Design a protein around this nucleic acid. Structure first.
Lengths: 58, 85, 89, 56, 84, 88
DNA sequence: ATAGCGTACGCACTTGAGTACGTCA
DNA sequence: TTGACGTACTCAAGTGCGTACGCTAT
């Protein structure tokens, strides 16, 4: 569980995107507004997740 | 699907975080350094994905799919004999 | 003896109930069953619509580790429990 | 699960203790003081987690 | 072992959150209804716990525990031939 | 050469067969390079498993699979016990 | 005669949000 | 030029934190 506010995430946005691919851990964005609540996944991990749900359904 | 560069994503970051929660569609981040590509998903939508991945990772969904196809029958949950099983 | 929904379990999935009993999770499992008898779509117990959505499989938490995976027949008002143990053993 | 700040958690503190047990969900406390992040879980769920850690 | 009531935990909430992260010992909350009892755990300690129970649910820890006492020998990671 | 000697259990080499056929070999090899230099390095989602007195550690190959290992700090030897977190 | 609750106060401290600049490859 | 990248400004809006009140249940 890595949690950071949107403001703190935007200050180190590029390092965040590298970390989510090198560490393979989702990063949860959460601040004062619930409309910003989101998760950041690496693309390779995201494609692996999409294939697991889709391949075993077929 | 919505695709954007990391630099463009940083300019419209607060607006992207509100799009994944309203449009319920992931935002793909693709830039010149493709090894740093990522995707933004709303938290409520991600909870269903993480729950599904957890049940797949433990082999539970393999049991669920195999049990859906068998002809073992059905028992009402009130008729379960807990003292013998 | 009467409720909004009939909760049942696949007989091949009854093996999970024995692991629930010996893990002292029977009390938490029966709380899921009572909600499934009244409203299997109630936003409680970490209710979640599993992926892919069109297969219409649902999940509720017995605790942090184990889930009740089930489908719902809306015509006959029946809940079919397909799994009650989320560990590989 | 739920992520919230300690200020928001304190306004609904009693409902928080019921939800972690009734929903068997961890509620993460994350505010500006990023080094004081914590999680609140139900006791019965915590007991099961303890038994899982020390099972052989 | 720190046990406290829900009302006093609410009044000391910010200090309890700093306590679990400095002492790495959880705080227990016990009130009039035992079914609402909760535990406060530091996030970094919770990461070790979640990773452990995840590797337990997948059956990995049982394999790890069995491989620790199987007497099968060890091979250097450089002597691994990926073509075979 | 390197700070630590990285070994894998013989009964765990079948995990490397699945690592090879899942295109995770590059990710697994980046982990074993870190294990040669510093197995306690705060990278790759390094985590100390519970119970802490058994001193088991894990690093993420991807979102699903982990490298589970112990470290012989006396002899500077890392023993990989698992490289595939799925039952098959 | 105290916890269990929902709710509030005051102010220092931070986030939120759009927007911008200078440097680098 | 470009995206990548670290860094910066600004003011409205919110949190942090101790502390408190009125009321019910005990």
């Amino acid at each position: 569980m890595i949690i950071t506010s949107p403001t703190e995430a935007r200050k180190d946005f590029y390092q965040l995107l590298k970390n989510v691919n090198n560490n393979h851990e989702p990063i949860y964005i959460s601040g004062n507004n619930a409309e910003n609540n989101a998760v950041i996944i690496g693309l390779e991990d995201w494609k692996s997740i999409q294939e697991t749900i889709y391949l075993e359904s077929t | 699907m919505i695709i954007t560069s990391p630099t463009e994503a940083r300019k419209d970051f607060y607006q992207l975080l509100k799009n994944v929660n309203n449009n319920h569609e992931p935002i793909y981040i693709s830039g010149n350094n493709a090894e740093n590509n990522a995707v933004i998903i709303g938290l409520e939508d991600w909870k269903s994905i993480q729950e599904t991945i957890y049940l797949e990772s433990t082999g539970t969904m393999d049991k669920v799919r195999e049990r859906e196809k068998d002809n073992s029958g059905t028992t009402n949950i009130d008729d379960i004999d807990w003292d013998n099983l | 003896h009467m409720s909004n929904y009939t909760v049942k379990i696949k007989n091949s999935a009854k093996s999970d109930l024995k692991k629930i009993k010996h893990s002292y999770l029977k009390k938490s499992f029966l709380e899921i069953v009572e909600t499934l008898k009244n409203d299997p779509y109630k936003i409680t117990q970490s209710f979640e619509k599993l992926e892919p959505k069109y297969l219409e499989r649902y999940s509720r938490r017995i605790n942090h580790q184990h889930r009740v995976v089930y489908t719902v027949d809306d015509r006959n008002k029946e809940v079919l429990i397909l799994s009650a143990w989320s560990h590989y053993d």
